[PDB]
Amino acid sequence: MTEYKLVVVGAGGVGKSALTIQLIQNHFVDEYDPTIEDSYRKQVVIDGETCLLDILDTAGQEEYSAMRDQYMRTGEGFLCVFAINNTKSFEDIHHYREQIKRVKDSEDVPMVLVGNKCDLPSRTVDTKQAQDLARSYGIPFIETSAKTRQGVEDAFYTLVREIRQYRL
Numbered sequence: 001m002t003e004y005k006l007v008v009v010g011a012g013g014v015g016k017s018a019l020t021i022q023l024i025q026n027h028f029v030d031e032y033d034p035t036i037e038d039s040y041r042k043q044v045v046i047d048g049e050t051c052l053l054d055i056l057d058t059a060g061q062e063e064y065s066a067m068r069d070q071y072m073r074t075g076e077g078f079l080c081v082f083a084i085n086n087t088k089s090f091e092d093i094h095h096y097r098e099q100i101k102r103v104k105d106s107e108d109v110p111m112v113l114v115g116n117k118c119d120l121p122s123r124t125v126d127t128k129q130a131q132d133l134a135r136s137y138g139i140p141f142i143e144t145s146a147k148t149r150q151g152v153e154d155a156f157y158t159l160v161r162e163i164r165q166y167r168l
């Protein structure tokens with residue numbers, strides 16, 4: 001049974017928990033404690049392949065978690081999330097990518113840049129800025145809305161496709 005272990009990272013408030021809950025449970029949760037870190041597993045079909053997703057929704061807290069360490073060590077791909085109406089969260093992306101590179105001791109880790117909250121009209125990070133950053137890292141950029149589901153499967157499934165390419 002094919003399995004893909006994914007990790008969702010990025011600044012507090014960008015929609016990591018809402019994106020993960022949307023993917024797994026097909027609804028938008030508008031309040032979810034920003035300190036809760038949990039994993040979610042689901043059987044899905046991606047490009048006709050039945051597979052298991054095993055996703056860590058990180059929360060950036062200081063307390064030790066053996067599970068968190070395990071997902072960093074064995075996680076196969078990472079979503080790096082910012083919000084398109086939060087310039088600071090976009091400025092914070094580079095730090096998350098640098099951490100992931102250190103965990104893997106590698107420049108080539110399957111990764112997707114995710115610009116969430118694209119349903120909102122107050123866009124302060126434009127598509128070109130994000131596309132240029134993604135191009136600099138050599139990774140895809142996907143715009144998402146956890147509220148409407150726009151791009152949500154694309155973001156996670158694109159990550160799965162990046163993993164598939166890496167495995168070859």
Ligand SMILES: Nc1nc2c(ncn2[C@@H]2O[C@H](COP(=O)(O)OP(=O)(O)O)[C@@H](O)[C@H]2O)c(=O)[nH]1
Pocket residue numbers: 010011012013014015016017018019029030031032033034116117118119120144145146147148
């Ligand atoms: N409009 C909008 N609000 C969102 C979206 N995703 C998350 N939110 C809201 O943004 C806030 C932070 O979301 P949350 O999932 O807790 O973010 P996390 O701290 O990254 O886990 C909450 O108020 C969510 O309701 C989205 O796509 N659109």
Ligand SMILES: [Mg+2]
Pocket residue numbers: 016017018032033034035036058059
């Ligand atoms: Mg959260």
